[PDB]
């Protein structure tokens, strides 16, 4: 009896693959990649336009050697099947013309650049739904004082970005 649970009451496996869908059957569907702005290849993390697609299976990993994901543990999120052009399938947050945005990198990232996320359960509806926090390494004590949200750009790409009052609610579903 811990925290992270999928869309089946079942516990989330550290290093397992899941579909990150929305709480509301609106907005969009699962998470996937897309080539936005002036990127050479799919480096932008977005929420599928299709509000019915399960998106890409996402690996959720904690540094801890536990089979489950420890409470209040920072996690890294990466695509099970990356775009190839990415040096790593792990997400990271970089400064973009639209503010800190969730993107993949062509350069190999260090642990501290990808382990910047953390889940927040929502007891509302009791259904397994979580808000995604973004943590930045301050000094001997990181600060998870920010959430990840959406930024519908010019072409309609639902980009995952760092926001303050536009948090994202997700339900993890095994893949």
């Amino acid at each position: 009896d811990d925290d992270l649970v999928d869309a089946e009451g079942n516990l989330v496996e550290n290093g397992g693959t899941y579909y990150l869908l929305p709480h509301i059957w609106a907005h969009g569907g699962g998470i996937e990649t897309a080539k936005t702005g002036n990127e050479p290849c799919p480096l932008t993390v977005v929420r599928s336009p299709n509000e019915v697609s399960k998106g890409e299976p996402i690996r959720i990993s904690s540094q801890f050697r536990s089979l489950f994901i420890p409470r209040g543990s920072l996690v890294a999120l990466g695509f099970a099947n990356p775009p190839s052009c990415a040096a790593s399938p792990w997400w990271t947050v970089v400064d973009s013309p639209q503010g800190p945005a969730v993107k993949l990198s062509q350069q190999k990232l260090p642990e501290k650049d990808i382990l910047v996320f953390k889940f927040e359960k929502v007891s509302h509806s009791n259904i397994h739904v979580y808000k995604l926090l973004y943590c930045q390494h301050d000094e001997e004590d990181v600060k998870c004082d920010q959430y990840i949200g959406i930024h519908r750009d010019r072409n309609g790409n639902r980009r995952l970005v760092v926001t303050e009052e536009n948090p994202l609610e997700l339900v993890l579903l095994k893949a």
């Binding site: 009896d1 496996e13 290093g15 540094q63 801890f64 536990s66 089979l67 920072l74 642990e111």
Partner: protein
């Protein structure tokens, strides 16, 4: 345990399995009433299972004992993974025999190169999972601090040490957490964390038990 071997039934008498309806972490029996595990393995209502080999079925030598107190190190930081240690007090003393025995605490830190025994029921495969029914064993050396830090820049505090192979191929993995790292007959480490499993240049990182001994002895004497 990735790249290890079947220990053998009751050949690691101090190895314990923390159960909450199912095995979720390992631990180390230090005396008839106390178990040492990882702080990140904290859970309420933990049942401690001693004398285990095949964790899926009863074989005659197990002892199932509920935990009455679970004490997570005061300085545990789930963010930085630092101070990853937890003490468990059994609400009932364990019957010490040949299959159930305590492992002594180190009153001095072990040096790099010392060979250690790491055990658990965690994942045994790479880029895929396969959890064993029985206890797996692995022999690995303590690595030097400079090497540990070069493998995990900015992530290694003084309460951690690396053990394993820079070459990769052998290491602890998901499900081994809280487990024992015994060297020269003393519990020098606790299976804590790592980047992946048995990956190249990413050896297992373990809680440095020798820094917490005075605290462990103190807690045991007043709880």
């Amino acid at each position: 345990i990735v790249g290890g071997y079947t220990c053998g039934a009751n050949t690691v008498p101090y190895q314990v399995s923390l159960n909450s309806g199912y095995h979720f972490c390992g631990g180390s029996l230090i005396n008839s009433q106390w178990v040492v595990s990882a702080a990140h393995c904290y859970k309420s209502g933990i049942q401690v299972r001693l004398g285990e080999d095949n964790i899926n079925v009863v074989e005659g030598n197990e002892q199932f004992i509920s935990a009455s107190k679970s004490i997570v190190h005061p300085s545990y930081n789930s963010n930085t993974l630092n101070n990853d240690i937890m003490l468990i007090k059994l609400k009932s003393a364990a019957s010490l025999n040949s299959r159930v025995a305590s492992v002594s605490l180190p009153t001095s830190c072990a040096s790099a190169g010392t060979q250690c025994l790491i055990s658990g029921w965690g994942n045994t495969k790479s880029s895929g999972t396969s959890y064993p029914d029985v206890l797996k064993c692995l022999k690995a050396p303590i690595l030097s601090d400079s090497s540990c830090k070069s493998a995990y820049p900015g992530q290694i505090t003084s309460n951690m040490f690396c053990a394993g192979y820079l070459e990769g191929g052998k290491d602890s993995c998901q499900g081994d957490s809280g487990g024992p790292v015994v060297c020269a007959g003393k519990l020098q480490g606790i299976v804590s964390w790592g980047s992946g499993c048995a990956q190249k240049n990413k050896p297992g990182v373990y809680t440095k038990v020798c820094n917490y001994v005075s605290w462990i002895k103190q807690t045991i004497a007043s709880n």
